[PDB]
Design a protein around this ligand. Structure first.
Ligand code: HEM
Lengths: 438, 55
């Protein structure tokens, strides 16, 4: 039984959430923000990512060089990432360097220069990032997957934004973005590891007290996405490995089917030919794929957003003449979530997940990420006892009902990259979403 | 004819051969498709379709 997550608020509406671990010597403190690229329109798309660069370019007090030195002197590091719905800025340090790190984070978020000279400098760095993501195949595949599934909608936009916007982002629109979005009621200060909650609350009162509150304070993790069945083919015969993602519209964080969808995902599971144990996994798809050498890997996912999600699988394969078999057998295993699954598969997947949801949190950064994610999506940290009860409530017959309304005979979003000549047209893929025998 | 003009022997042999010939024709129809399968169907543009196939 892990120590209890303590939670306090400030007057502005900033949440402070902490989980202490007296066995470790480091601490991850940071700011989780319920805001990301999805909050941009088409004209300022890329702003959130642009700001992440300039946050480390110097403040009203410390210059870029002074900033570098201050963190070097602390001994730990700072890190940041911007997603579609979430922005994170954290600092890993020593136990007694926590007041320094909170002070630096408060500075870069509230009091950043955003000097025209630095905007102009980063504008090239970010332009170069557009031509180097091209190598990260998984990211290419998932960005096209969002673009097509949420065609012409805010969730469909990339985080980097178009080339055109990068050239036209001003300090004015940067300032406007962070003033509108980085408000106290949307922010959570998180501490995990060697942190005292009461000390962290005092540091929040000292540094984050003059944060703006939004005009209309909605609860944390408050949002209509209209999924498009569609495909993107990025054929490249010179690549040796095909990368394919297939997804349906999945579930939001607060869906009643959230846990049902996780169990369904665990029934298919993951596979990697490079891992020794993968040939012996219980998953039927794993067995088919390994015995027939159909793939190098597959990874089931159930990605959630505030008001929608994507549920599907990501495949990589060198077997270019049997892509058809790989996709065929994958979708036939999904069909069985509707037609065939019983207590045998469901109880097995529940066993595996009851541990998996706890295992994931193995370092202070993972714990902080868990507290921060849950507070910004659900408005609260869900205790392991509650999670164990929600998993236990999932029956085989919940899974069947969920798959019958979510997967069975449904439109898919499909992205193929690489030597995908063997990937059949949309209809033949989508025809495998049902079984004529059932 | 099986005789000196068209008559009964001619009719009876035409019946037997009329029955047979459609089976021979089916075989040749199959053969021309097997022969075609090496290049595949042509198309109205007259170009290769190897670049863009449909089931
Ligand atoms: C019982 C008679 C026949 C049947 C059932 C038949 C059937 C077919 C079928 C199903 C195809 C492929 C689809 C199509 O292009 O229409 C085809 C293609 C072809 N047939 Fe026939 N056929 C017959 C007679 C003939 C005759 C009399 C000729 C030539 C004098 C011929 C020459 C061809 C050729 C050259 C093709 C390839 C056309 C192309 O795709 O570019 N067939 N046939």
């Amino acid at each position: 039984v892990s120590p209890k997550t303590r939670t306090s608020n400030l007057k502005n509406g900033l949440t402070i959430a902490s989980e202490s671990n007296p066995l470790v010597q480091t601490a991850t403190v940071g700011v989780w923000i319920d805001a990301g690229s999805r909050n941009e329109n088409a004209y300022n798309n890329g702003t959130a990512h642009f700001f992440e660069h300039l946050a480390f370019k110097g403040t009203d007090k410390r210059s870029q060089h002074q900033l570098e030195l201050d963190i070097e002197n602390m001994g730990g590091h700072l890190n940041a990432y911007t997603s579609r719905e979430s922005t994170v800025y954290y600092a890993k340090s020593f136990k007694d360097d926590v007041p320094k790190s909170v002070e630096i984070l408060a500075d870069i978020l509230q009091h950043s220069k955003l000097a025209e000279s630095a905007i102009d400098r980063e504008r090239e760095v970010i332009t170069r990032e557009l031509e180097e993501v091209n190598k990260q195949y998984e990211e290419v595949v998932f960005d096209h997957l969002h673009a097509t599934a949420f065609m012409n909608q805010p969730l469909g936009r990339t985080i980097l934004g178009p080339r055109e916007n990068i050239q036209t982002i001003t300090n004015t629109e940067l300032r406007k973005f962070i003033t509108e979005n980085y408000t106290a009621d949307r922010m959570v200060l998180v501490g995990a590891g060697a942190v005292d909650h009461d000390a962290l609350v005092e540091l929040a009162e000292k540094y984050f007290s003059h944060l703006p509150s939004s005009q209309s304070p909605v609860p944390l993790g408050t949002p209509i996405p209209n999924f498009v069945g569609s495909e993107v083919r990025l054929r490249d015969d010179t690549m040796p490995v095909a990368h394919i993602a297939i997804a349906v519209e999945g579930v939001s964080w607060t869906s009643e089917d959230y846990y049902t969808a996780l169990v369904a995902q665990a029934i298919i599971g993951n596979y990697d030919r490079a891992v020794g144990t993968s040939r012996h996994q219980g998953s039927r798809l794993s067995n088919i794929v390994s015995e027939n050498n159909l793939a190098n890997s597959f990874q089931s996912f159930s990605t959630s957003y505030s008001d929608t999600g994507l549920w599907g699988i990501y495949l990589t394969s060198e077997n270019t003449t049997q892509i058809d078999d790989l996709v065929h057998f994958t979708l036939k295993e999904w069909n069985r979530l509707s037609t065939s699954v019983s207590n045998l598969q469901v109880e097995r997947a529940k066993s595996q997940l009851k541990a998996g949801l706890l295992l994931s949190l193995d370092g202070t950064t993972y714990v902080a990420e868990d507290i921060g994610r849950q507070l910004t999506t659900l408005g609260r940290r869900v205790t392991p006892a509650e999670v164990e009860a929600k998993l236990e409530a999932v029956t085989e017959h919940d899974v069947r009902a969920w798959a019958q309304k979510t997967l069975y005979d449904k439109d898919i979003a499909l992205v193929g990259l690489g030597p995908i000549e063997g990937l059949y047209d949309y209809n033949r893929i989508r025809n495998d979403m049902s079984m004529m025998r059932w | 004819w099986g005789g000196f003009s068209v008559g009964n022997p001619t009719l009876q042999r035409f019946f037997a051969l009329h029955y047979l010939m459609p089976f021979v024709l089916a075989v040749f129809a199959l053969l021309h498709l097997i022969a075609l399968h090496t290049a595949g169907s042509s198309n109205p543009l007259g170009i290769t379709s190897n670049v863009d196939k449909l089931s």
